[PDB]
Amino acid sequence: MLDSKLKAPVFTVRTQGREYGEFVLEPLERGFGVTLGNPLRRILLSSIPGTAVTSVYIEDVLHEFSTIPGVKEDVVEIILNLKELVVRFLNPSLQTVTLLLKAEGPKEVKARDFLPVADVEIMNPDLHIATLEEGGRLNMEVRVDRGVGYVPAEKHGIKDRINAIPVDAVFSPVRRVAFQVEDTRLGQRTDLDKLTLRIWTDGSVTPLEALNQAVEILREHLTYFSNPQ
Template sequence: GFGHTLGNSLRRTLLSSIPGAAITQVNFDDAIHEFDVIEGVYEDVTDILLNLKDVVVRLDSDEPAVLRLDAQGPGEVTAGQFSQTADVEVLSGDLVIATLSQNGRIGMEVTIEKGRGYLSAEGNKVSTAVGQIPVDSIFSPVRRVSFEVEPTRVEQSTDFDRLTLEIETDGSMSPREALASAGGTLRNLIQLVEEMSEEPQSLELTEVVTGTAGSPDLELGIEDLELSERPNNCLKRAQIHTIGELILKSEADLLSITNFGQKSLDEIIEKLDERGHQLALKD
């Protein structure tokens, strides 16, 4: 009966350690920092950066790639308008990045890189060049994982588990591919234990994530939980802005927030569970 052991291990690995690609930097023709406003564009640069964070891409090269976008108003600017290369495919072509007025114009170049988990804009800040703006990057292609364990019978034995996994990805990788990658990562880690020796062993982390393994999304805003309006607004009023800040709170802490009820609490518990997190235990 190792269903729960295997299910938890696979879920955490799927949420934290599957490689993917994302936009890490952007250079605007007419803006030099995130608080700028581009004439003829309804969104400010901060809003455009938030939209760029949601662009789903597939990168077939280990080297960074640069895509160019030029658009003239009026109308919406979508991710599908990026100039694509042989190594890069934009999968969320209908995603709206900005809206232009009659005489509006926008031009930008974005850098796309491979990575794992989540990296904040501060972590992507590798250059102090004027006009190069780092972006929060969600590299993981896995959006949600849940599993169910049921008792099952094999011939005369009744102490076996049936493990059912439900995996949702962003389309840049299939659930089957993500599961295979997670299995490979766990296999390499277990192999270190199997070959245990007195000498320290190292593992080349081409298969295993470094740094924030198990919790790459703690710096993500609570908006990424896709909560309904009431719990989302209640958390913001309580100055809880990231997933990391949220999991430091207990159920009692949340229920003490004005207008925050059991229904909102149940929703948050479910959303955190999908990402492999839980609220703090009461002191």
């Protein structure tokens, strides 16, 4: 095609690794870069459902504000480090997976120390959970779920074991989104929108992939306007 349709969004991509991915697309009519970038953003953060530590149970610990002997870190610092943990399950059959880990004595507890689960993978192995001295006994069960957005530990209140403590839900492979709408000049008219959105990702998925998922959720939602009533 040649005139109005060939003059079409030149989708250009720049991605390094699975974390960063810039995406440019121009020309666009008046105030459309915004019209597109904004929704995609709102989707890219909430919708690309993900995984986050939803609950924790240290065996001798009762409340979240306690400290474990032989363990430098305090319960609150550890439950915090767990929010840093990124896991990845392969299929719907895995809604809530409880990862288990128990380590004793003079060893450093990293995420690779959790007993492997069949359909689940840990992308954050070397992450640091704790530093055990001597006579250091840490046996815990950390829940993991698939959800969307941010869910305060107060909102869900998970109950696996009565002495367990819920954690805040960081549900997203997407770290941050960012879009800029700068003018571009195409021959005749100057007023032009150039939309470029930068997406960052924990590694689980890729910027491109994410973006694709995003647009679909929008598309799928635009279809929901079918049957009047």
